[PDB]
Design a binder for these strands. Sequence first.
RNA 1: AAGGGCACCACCAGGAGUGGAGCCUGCGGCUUAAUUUGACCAACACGGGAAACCUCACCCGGCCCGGACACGGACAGGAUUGACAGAUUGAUAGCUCUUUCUCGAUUCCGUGGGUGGUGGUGCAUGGCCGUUCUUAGUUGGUGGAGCGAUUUGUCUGGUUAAUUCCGAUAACGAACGAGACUCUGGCAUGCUAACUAGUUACGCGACCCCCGAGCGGUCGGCGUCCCCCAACUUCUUAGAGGGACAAGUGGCGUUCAGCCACCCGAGAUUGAGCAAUAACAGGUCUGUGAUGCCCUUAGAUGUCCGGGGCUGCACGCGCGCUACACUGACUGGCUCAGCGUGUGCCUACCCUACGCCGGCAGGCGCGGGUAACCCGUUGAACCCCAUUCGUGAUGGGGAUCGGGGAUUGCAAUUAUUCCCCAUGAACGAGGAAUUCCCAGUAAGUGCGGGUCAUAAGCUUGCGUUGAUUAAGUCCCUGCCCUUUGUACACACCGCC
Lengths: 55, 104, 67, 55, 98, 72, 171
Amino acid sequence: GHQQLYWSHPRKFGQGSRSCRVCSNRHGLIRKYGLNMCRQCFRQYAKDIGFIKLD
Amino acid sequence: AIHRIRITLTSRNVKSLEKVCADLIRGAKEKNLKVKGPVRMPTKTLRITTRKTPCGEGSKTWDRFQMRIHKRLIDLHSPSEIVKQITSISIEPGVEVEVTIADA
Amino acid sequence: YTTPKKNKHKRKKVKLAVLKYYKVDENGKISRLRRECPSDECGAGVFMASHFDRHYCGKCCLTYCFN
Amino acid sequence: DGFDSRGKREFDRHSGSDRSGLKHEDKRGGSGSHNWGTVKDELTLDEWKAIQNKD
Amino acid sequence: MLMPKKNRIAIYELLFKEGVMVAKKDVHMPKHPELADKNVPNLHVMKAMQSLKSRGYVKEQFAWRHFYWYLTNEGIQYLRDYLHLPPEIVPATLRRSR
Amino acid sequence: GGHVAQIYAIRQSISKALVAYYQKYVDEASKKEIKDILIQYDRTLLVADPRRCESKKFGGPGARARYQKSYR
Amino acid sequence: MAVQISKKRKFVADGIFKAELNEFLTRELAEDGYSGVEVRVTPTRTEIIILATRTQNVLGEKGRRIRELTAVVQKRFGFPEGSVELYAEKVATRGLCAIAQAESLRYKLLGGLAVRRACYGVLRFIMESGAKGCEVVVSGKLRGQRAKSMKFVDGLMIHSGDPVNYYVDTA
RNA sequence: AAGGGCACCACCAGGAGUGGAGCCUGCGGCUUAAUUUGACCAACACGGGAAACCUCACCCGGCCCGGACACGGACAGGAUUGACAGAUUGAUAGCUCUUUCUCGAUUCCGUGGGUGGUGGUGCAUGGCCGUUCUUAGUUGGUGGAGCGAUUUGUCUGGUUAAUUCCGAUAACGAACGAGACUCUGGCAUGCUAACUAGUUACGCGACCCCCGAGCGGUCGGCGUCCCCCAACUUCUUAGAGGGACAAGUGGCGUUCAGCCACCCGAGAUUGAGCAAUAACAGGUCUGUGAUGCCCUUAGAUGUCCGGGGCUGCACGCGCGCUACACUGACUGGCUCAGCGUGUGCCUACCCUACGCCGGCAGGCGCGGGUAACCCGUUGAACCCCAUUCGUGAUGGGGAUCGGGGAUUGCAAUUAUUCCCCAUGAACGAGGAAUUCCCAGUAAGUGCGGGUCAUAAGCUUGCGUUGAUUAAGUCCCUGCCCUUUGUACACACCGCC
Ligand SMILES: [Mg+2]
Ligand SMILES: [Mg+2]
Ligand SMILES: [Mg+2]
């Protein structure tokens, strides 16, 4: 609506306050080491970051 | 002045980190700066275990991603001033430094 | 669908004519028949609206009511 | 009638499409543009502001 | 879109200072990180840039969550006659030191 | 380690310490005739046990056990 | 210190930055023969090298696109002015870059060339430039509902073990 | 159809179990306004799916255009933009109505045209992933058989984990997969070193000592890079190297491949990661600014806000947790870990020592830590040692329920979690059946990571204690290969 209820619902926490830094999705998010990236968002870019598969 | 400096080196691959340590101490030994042997901090292993599939179907397989951070410390303790003496870093990509005075 | 309420009617603005809410006299003597909202941001350019019981500026220049 | 109560096919090898089936049938034997090939194919403003507001 | 003119000219003159414009895809961000003091939110920025893209004055690229609009030569002269500058002033990306 | 592991680390290190002490300071003729007694009783007195652990796998509770599966 | 970040989060941030920079340049310079990016970071300034098969298109007229790209990454990543510089460099053996070869294959397919005609053309180019082996797979639907996969192989190709990491280039 | 071979997702011999009981959770069903939805070995603690709001896709309502752009209208005499008060509304949404101002070309109306969608189709697709299959299989060159398609190579046999090798041999020489490889564990009193790891020695201390022990014993007491004011790397960390190859011996074997036993040796089979030709209309359009087509698009299937729901219960099933007890429970004392996390782009949320208050969950000050620097010598549980209980649904069990007190959160009812005091239900070892497993393994037992403002009965790892049986077979169940038959070749979900 107008400027007092369009974004009035608080989002300082919870699952609605964080999204995929790649595709904005709000499910299966990885926050470890400040990754802020999806489960699938991350598997695509894992080698570019440097997360190599050793074992 | 008398001064003492410490250079810490952080990297992801062992070979580069060993090279940059080796030529740093080698240059200082020729330069008669007293060098304390490069002490190796324990390696940090950042482990992220996700699920291979992008959906829910499968036979419950897990993918273990691994990241290794290697840290070294090199102490230069010469009787005279040091920062004006040594002014080259001779770094290769993948190696990050942080100069620090021994007071800190 | 089949919404129980009828379609809500949006407000249609009156499309008023020219303001003209101030008069001159004897070959020109300005007389404001309205109020000025006395906030500094509002200034003397805008005219505080006059209602049947309260006075409210066009901006948010407060509102004064006489009891 | 080809589905179960859940909605899964009881004959997954019986193609439900009239246009296409289990096999891929190549259009015109792989000829024409935008198609699989064939054997034949195989062979400055800031200073402007300064002079504007200086006077 | 209901951009006030002080907001519209602020966006345009920033785009003339550098032909590029980076804005996160976020309608709910209260202020663009650049031109924050003009108090025009990120929503007005993105909708302003999409109108130029439709008219062909700017070319849009989209990375992960960020737009990277680039000023085009077709939009160069439009920005000249909109903000009323002679054909002497050029963006920093167009010319540097020469 | 735990209580049992520290116990075995004690008896192993004690039997190792004096036999290496004899080797360093006295003749090894005495070392050999006390070492053969130690090995004939328990070789773990002078040789460490190599077994440590085994990593857990992503399909069961432990290293080799697997989670129960159902067919119907 | 407190104003700093832990080394574990710092290195993850560097990998995130490299991944996003790679993806943006993939979406921007793909038709310009983009191959890869090597970033060399020193505390004084960060150098970003764009390896491409065609430098004269990555940089525009009079180098306009270079300063356009440097400016657009300064504003994104909040780099200090003049603290990041971008170089364009031509990659030798363009036929041995899987990214470049796959880009050329997409360019042919969008042009409408037949799949067999295009794939055999790129296999000849890779073997001409010198490679132990190569293999292209084109999968999807063309002119019909049913999808299909075609595989064009020749030469040596390994699949398993550590040597795959430093002997196989994939796109 | 026959014949070989292999496998604890097959058995044998056993261990722990599940199915029996209560409860947590996921499916089906019933009910519902909605109880959103995908998936039926290879679905059912799976979608990292532990949902109060958000998430949300479902239901009931109400705002917003965030409908670009082009054209035509209307328009500075106003296109239009907001709004104090009252009603009205769940709402302090000027959402609408009475009400008069304010905003000034940005919009509004109409026609075309966008755009977005966790809307549909995974049987239109990409990518990824799962399974067949981690089984051992697969393919060129030259030569031989052939008129061809093809075949031999790629095999009677021995052997191996393995078409892994050896041998027969119209094949010879290869390639992929296996192996090799990377990571990890296990030994280096050998090398390079460490005030962000220490250890010995020494100097002060603190105590027990005195029978006197006196270079006596203890000290995580302080110090000796407080740089002039000890040395060293055994313990710890991490780099480079070494080290194991069936190496030696004995036996079997075509005396070949290899197999068995033993010695010395840290180790004579450490676990993973990767993983072929192909197939499965396998799963994912609800991961994506991956995506075709279709649907919807202003009374929206967009988006926001409020409430509810995803939890709802005659029943069925799956993964599990806790138990049925004395090989135990309770009380107290003693006492040992290792993975590993830690203060934030947006982003609001860190780990916590020490002191003070309360019985508790907790609260308040003082710090430390962006980290081998602080938590932290991670004083963990199990276990060990003493006390009570005494075979009794009992001091086993802690479901169900009442009252009260804290914490997080805007919001705790349909109880978020935790704490205290009350009740004390089934369960007396579980039918037919059925799962997992060969050494630091199973199992008992806790602890970190993810999820997280609050959160583990889940999962992912780690450490502690630590076994019984076996070194085999095709009996059951499957899988592979060869022969064989075929009217199948979209290939038995066939054809007819
Ligand atoms: Mg291998
Ligand atoms: Mg009670
Ligand atoms: Mg016949």
